[PDB]
Amino acid sequence: KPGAPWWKSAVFYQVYPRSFKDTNGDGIGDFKGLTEKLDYLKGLGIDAIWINPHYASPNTDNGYDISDYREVMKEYGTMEDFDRLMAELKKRGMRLMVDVVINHSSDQHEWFKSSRASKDNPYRDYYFWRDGKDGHEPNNYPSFFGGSAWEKDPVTGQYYLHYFGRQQPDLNWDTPKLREELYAMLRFWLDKGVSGMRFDTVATYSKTPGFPDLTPEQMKNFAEAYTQGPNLHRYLQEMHEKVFDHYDAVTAGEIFGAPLNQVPLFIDSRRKELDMAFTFDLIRYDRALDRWHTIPRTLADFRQTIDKVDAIAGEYGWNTFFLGNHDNPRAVSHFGDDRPQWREASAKALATVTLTQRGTPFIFQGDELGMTNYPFKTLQDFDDIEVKGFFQDYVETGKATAEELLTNVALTSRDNARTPFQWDDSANAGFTTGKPWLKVNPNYTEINAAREIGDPKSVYSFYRNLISIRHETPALSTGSYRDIDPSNADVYAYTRSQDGETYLVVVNFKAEPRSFTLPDGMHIAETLIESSSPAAPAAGAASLELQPWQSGIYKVK
Ligand SMILES: OC[C@H]1NC[C@H](O)[C@@H](O)[C@@H]1O
Ligand SMILES: [Ca+2]
Numbered sequence: 001k002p003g004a005p006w007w008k009s010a011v012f013y014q015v016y017p018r019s020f021k022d023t024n025g026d027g028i029g030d031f032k033g034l035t036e037k038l039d040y041l042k043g044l045g046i047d048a049i050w051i052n053p054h055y056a057s058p059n060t061d062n063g064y065d066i067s068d069y070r071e072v073m074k075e076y077g078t079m080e081d082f083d084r085l086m087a088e089l090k091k092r093g094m095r096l097m098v099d100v101v102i103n104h105s106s107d108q109h110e111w112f113k114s115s116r117a118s119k120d121n122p123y124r125d126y127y128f129w130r131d132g133k134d135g136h137e138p139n140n141y142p143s144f145f146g147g148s149a150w151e152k153d154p155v156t157g158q159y160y161l162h163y164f165g166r167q168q169p170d171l172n173w174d175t176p177k178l179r180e181e182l183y184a185m186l187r188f189w190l191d192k193g194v195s196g197m198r199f200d201t202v203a204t205y206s207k208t209p210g211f212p213d214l215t216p217e218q219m220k221n222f223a224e225a226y227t228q229g230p231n232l233h234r235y236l237q238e239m240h241e242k243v244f245d246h247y248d249a250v251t252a253g254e255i256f257g258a259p260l261n262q263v264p265l266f267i268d269s270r271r272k273e274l275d276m277a278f279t280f281d282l283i284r285y286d287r288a289l290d291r292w293h294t295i296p297r298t299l300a301d302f303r304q305t306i307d308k309v310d311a312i313a314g315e316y317g318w319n320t321f322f323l324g325n326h327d328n329p330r331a332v333s334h335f336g337d338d339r340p341q342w343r344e345a346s347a348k349a350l351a352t353v354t355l356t357q358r359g360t361p362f363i364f365q366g367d368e369l370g371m372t373n374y375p376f377k378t379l380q381d382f383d384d385i386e387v388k389g390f391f392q393d394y395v396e397t398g399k400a401t402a403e404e405l406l407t408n409v410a411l412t413s414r415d416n417a418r419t420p421f422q423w424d425d426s427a428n429a430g431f432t433t434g435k436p437w438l439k440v441n442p443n444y445t446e447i448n449a450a451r452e453i454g455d456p457k458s459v460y461s462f463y464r465n466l467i468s469i470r471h472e473t474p475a476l477s478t479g480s481y482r483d484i485d486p487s488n489a490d491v492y493a494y495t496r497s498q499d500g501e502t503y504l505v506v507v508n509f510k511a512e513p514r515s516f517t518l519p520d521g522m523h524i525a526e527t528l529i530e531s532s533s534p535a536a537p538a539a540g541a542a543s544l545e546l547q548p549w550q551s552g553i554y555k556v557k
Helices: 031-036 038-044 079-091 110-115 176-190 216-220 232-242 299-312 343-354 385-395 402-412 449-453 459-472
Strands: 012-015 048-051 068-072 095-100 150-153 158-161 196-199 250-254 276-278 360-364 480-483 491-498 501-508 514-517 524-531 543-546 551-556
Touching: 031 038, 031 079, 038 459, 048 196, 068 079, 068 176, 079 095, 176 196, 176 232, 299 480, 299 491, 343 459, 343 501, 343 524, 343 551, 385 402, 449 459, 459 524, 491 514, 501 514, 501 543
Parallel strands: 012 048, 012 360, 048 095, 095 196, 196 250, 250 276
Antiparallel strands: 150 158, 480 491, 491 501, 501 551, 514 543, 524 551
């Protein structure tokens, strides 16, 4: 003692409700579906669930465009269903983390309908309204979802700001009354017993006074420029002081776009801002600036990025660790090898990495099954507004052909992570009895929960066993982290240590046999678990012979 907070040793599971489990045949997942599957998650060993936005929403961005912060999304159920989900999680000693989207609201939110009525409306300053310049928009800000970040509203002739979709106007945190409304809203959910909140694009809350144009340089990486608002930390510290200081909920911020060196300002516990951070340096380590092309990287880049992110946590900060989420391609497809002969092996290898990283691991729904990217055939197979945005910015402008967009976005699209969870091999993998909102991956015939749960050699069983091991081994949670050799592009090896106990994690990222020599003086003591291994090393081993994609966790001496 002091002991570590429950969130530092917990294993979280991210549920994208819309695609988890449908119970009424409309093809959309819902609260009753998630509730019916809590035993599944409890059995896997999950301590807490983070659910994507579940509030009233027109769904132009699947929940991230909120029209009423105190009502549940019609598609997911009623408040009664949300309350029941809460109660069932508690009966199982599980915690719930909800998504908080307060960088912007839906343009259907009552605040916006009011704001847009006139320049003198009491809600005018709840958003950003500005006069155009030189015949066009206020400045050159681009939107993440296509075109300008400024939309003209003829009702007043001014433009309103939207970093994301035109139906997601940005909230004006410079307005005290708006901040107070957001705080009351957070208390509304916190009073219901919510255990955590994940703050969507938490680094963009502060806008730059005067909205000057982005420089040519900033334009190439506008995501970073939007995180440089001068009042950001003041706002975060105020929110902590006014809200979180009065509850025992964990806060996690999605720091997208921010330079890694600034992350400590968000998570250093002494600053009283956020408890932990979701960074994207790793998950986007091979993504081009335009966000739809990929750039070839090696394990050397992968581990060096992890090393830099871990270092940033220092002694008072804390990181979450994830290899996938609802905005990125599937982990095994992105970091592993999803070819049939290597999918399971690499998926287990990635699981070992995830569950042995320093920080709070988040498992995205389906990754415990080894789900893969989807085989998109036409641009119409994508539902995502972001893909429509790339079409607008790159195809309609003649920068790329529709075929080039398809070829590339098929590998990076958010829709890859949004296909229905594959429960079994019944119609539409047991996700729905109706027509799914997004097509189920045809590989559900071999990749599904029912098939993996009863098989000791499945990806699921491996995740389950890793989660047990993590729970029983303190060092694998809060222990220190040290990369054995940052320049090695074949075998990822590192140690986790705490209170004199040290563990070695070794993962072969190559589809070929490789060798690993332990550091001078270090020797294998015991083997906790291995995947794709014919035999464990013998006690005292000073080196290991690795099979393709083999992974293992060992106690060393
Ligand atoms: O809200 C905008 C953007 N924020 C980040 C979320 O992960 C993503 O799904 C959403 O579209
Ligand atoms: Ca439904």
